[PDB]
From Swiss-Prot, chains A, B:
Binding site for substrate: 76-80, 116, 163, 190
Catalysed reaction, written as an equation: 7-aminomethyl-7-carbaguanine + guanosine(34) in tRNA = 7-aminomethyl-7-carbaguanosine(34) in tRNA + guanine
Residue sites binding Zn(2+) per the record: 278, 280, 283, 309
Gene designation: tgt
Source taxonomy: Bacteria, Pseudomonadati, Pseudomonadota, Alphaproteobacteria, Sphingomonadales
Active site: 76 (proton acceptor), 240 (nucleophile)
InterPro entries per UniProt: ArchSynthase1/Queuine_TRR, TGT, TGT-like_sf, tRNA_ribo_trans-like
Protein's name in the database: Queuine tRNA-ribosyltransferase
Species, as recorded: Zymomonas mobilis subsp. mobilis (strain ATCC 31821 / ZM4 / CP4)
């Protein structure tokens, strides 16, 4: 396989399905990328840089070996999480374009994200523009850092991240800057930051067509099953979200009939599996009643079973999306999905 | 298979190895019986009677179906746990011989324990004798209750529980009472209650030979790997203990070189598996360093991996014990084990 090759096998409206070929594997698109701790998983740059440290991970052989995962790994650039959990033209103290790229190289990830500024919401036009301008300067710095490390330039891929808040002209300027620099793929940043789905979809409507059509489009931090379906309708190819994982440990299971909270007493005698159609290993062997029982008793096994189911549900959703676009039936699927989920 | 048949295939000193045949399966002895939530697992009578209730479990099809486990299940009679976590000749208010047997029938377990009084330690001779006498009266009541329920009498087995604290004459009187009643197997109760290993072994030395030789001997609540090896040397065939499960969720892993606390910083860069020889799935794929990383991050996956390893370690210990007795090499094994573990 090549370092990076994206091929679109089929289209329906703005929705696409295809494959990214990389040296460690093929990624079928549209793709859901779960956290590692699926064709590609997400590493946690912010956590790892603090514990055990990027250098320590490199000493242990890089994240593939550490985690026992030999397929592609995507890493975020770290500043989203810095801003959220912990500033100058050089970067952030609490990380810079150059240090972020270096950390991601030490971790050994296959898809590397440019170091950006996820503009808070709401933002005024002026503020959105200053922030986006800084991110575009950081995007060029990220490009140059990545290109300067041969092992990285030759074996990994670099994605640029569009900013501009909710403003069409700033999103256009950002898309133009990123395409002039040139990246392997393009993320839509600055969303899923409290603006709500209608506004997110409005911004995606004009923002995704500004990105190069022939490269993958990644919507960062999205999301709920319905967010994902609507984003695919708008031209998005890749997704990451902690919802499946966090939901799992909180008693929430995803089903084709919507999310359920398994701790509710209504499940104490329910002998159905978490979802009726789900092909996952949990749904093959255990009832809602037993998983309810485990979670209420504080058993670790319960939360593990829930998480496994939720990650499998999300991959079943992406498979159904891929097959439906390939078959010219995605419009119908989305409408069928929505009808039942809500 | 028959309702209950114990066959001794090989002996070495007081140690035995063999099989219990029951309708739902064969149990190889000496056996470790982990908590269900291995050839046999333990159900949690005390928890289940409170949530969701024995009747509710019966309504859901019994514990085999509930848990998705079609092999034998052993249940304790509930009063140990009542005494520990929450009194008259009739029973305890907070359970009686009759109610305990009924609960175990509703749960559907295959090996049913008599309802006893686990005498606190230390106990004076007088107190130990009064308590043991009451337990023997309750043992006869437990026998009669079990025999009165046809589905239970015909498909399950009933074990009697020897008491007497640390006193030889009371242990003898208890053994005599239980054998006069008649049971399918015999447990040594009243130990692992704070007396320490030397005292436990001293009591086992005279107590196990008082029990019928041709029936299984169960030491309740034991224990650490070295406790198990020494008890087998003294004629014990069956074990249960929450240590593997609790240790798992607390950062403690069992290894042939002794227990380790994986959270210790000394493991942060250790690329060895939890144990070098262990055949378990965790030890096949992941390092001490990664499990350390997961547990320190509070990931559920870490505690699950630890627990899986510990349950597998205990089953590997019992397999080695079985094979060594069968081969006439258990004395050597025990000495080799001890040398390395400590
Ligand atoms: C939830 N909303 C959302 N997240 C965004 C991210 C981060 C994407 N997810 C990274 C994961 C988060 C969980 C971690 C764990 C365990 C692993 C990394 C972004 N990252 C960037 N760089 N820019 C955006 O504008 C950006 C915008 C985002 N919006
Ligand atoms: C730890 N020491 C120990 N335990 C004893 C028990 C209980 C055996 N284990 C039952 C398990 C405990 C964990 C539960 C969970 C999850 C599942 C049941 C006993 N039960 C009896 N009846 N009598 C004794 O003298 C008796 C003596 C015991 N000593
Ligand atoms: Zn499922
Ligand atoms: Zn192991």
């Amino acid at each position: 396989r090549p370092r990076f090759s994206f091929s679109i096998a089929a289209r329906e409206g703005k929705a696409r399905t295809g494959t990214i070929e990389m040296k460690r594997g093929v990624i079928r698109t549209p793709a859901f990328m779960p956290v590692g701790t699926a064709d590609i998983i997400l590493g946690n740059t912010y956590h790892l840089m603090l514990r055990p440290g990027a250098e320590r991970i490199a000493k242990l052989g890089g994240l593939h070996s550490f985690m026992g995962w030999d397929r592609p790994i995507l890493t975020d650039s770290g500043g989203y999480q810095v801003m959220s959990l912990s500033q100058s033209e050089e970067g952030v103290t609490f990380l810079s374009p150059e240090r972020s790229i270096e950390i991601q190289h030490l971790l050994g990830s296959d898809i590397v994200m440019a170091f950006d500024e996820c503009t808070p919401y709401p933002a005024t036009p002026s503020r959105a523009a200053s922030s986006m301008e800084r991110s575009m300067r950081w995007a060029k710095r990220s490009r140059d850092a990545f290109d300067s490390r041969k092992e990285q330039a030759e074996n990994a891929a670099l994605f640029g991240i569009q900013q501009g808040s909710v403003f069409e002209n700033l999103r256009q300027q950002s898309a133009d800057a990123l395409a002039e620099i040139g990246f392997d793929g393009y993320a839509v940043g600055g969303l899923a930051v409290g603006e709500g789905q209608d506004e997110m979809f409005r911004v995606l409507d004009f923002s995704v067509p500004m990105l190069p059509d022939d490269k993958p489009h990644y919507l960062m931090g999205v999301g709920k099953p319905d967010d994902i379906v609507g984003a695919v309708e708008r031209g998005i190819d890749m997704f990451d979200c902690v919802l499946p994982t966090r939901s799992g440990r909180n008693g929430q299971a995803f089903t084709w009939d919507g999310p359920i909270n398994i701790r509710n007493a209504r499940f104490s005698e329910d002998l159905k599996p978490l979802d009726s159609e789900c092909h996952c290993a949990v749904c093959q062997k255990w009832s809602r009643a037993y998983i309810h029982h485990l979670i209420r008793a504080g058993e670790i096994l319960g939360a593990m079973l829930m998480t496994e189911h939720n990650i499998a549900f999300y991959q079943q959703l992406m498979q159904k999306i891929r097959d439906s676009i390939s078959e010219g039936r995605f419009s119908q699927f989305a409408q069928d999905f929505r009808a039942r989920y809500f």
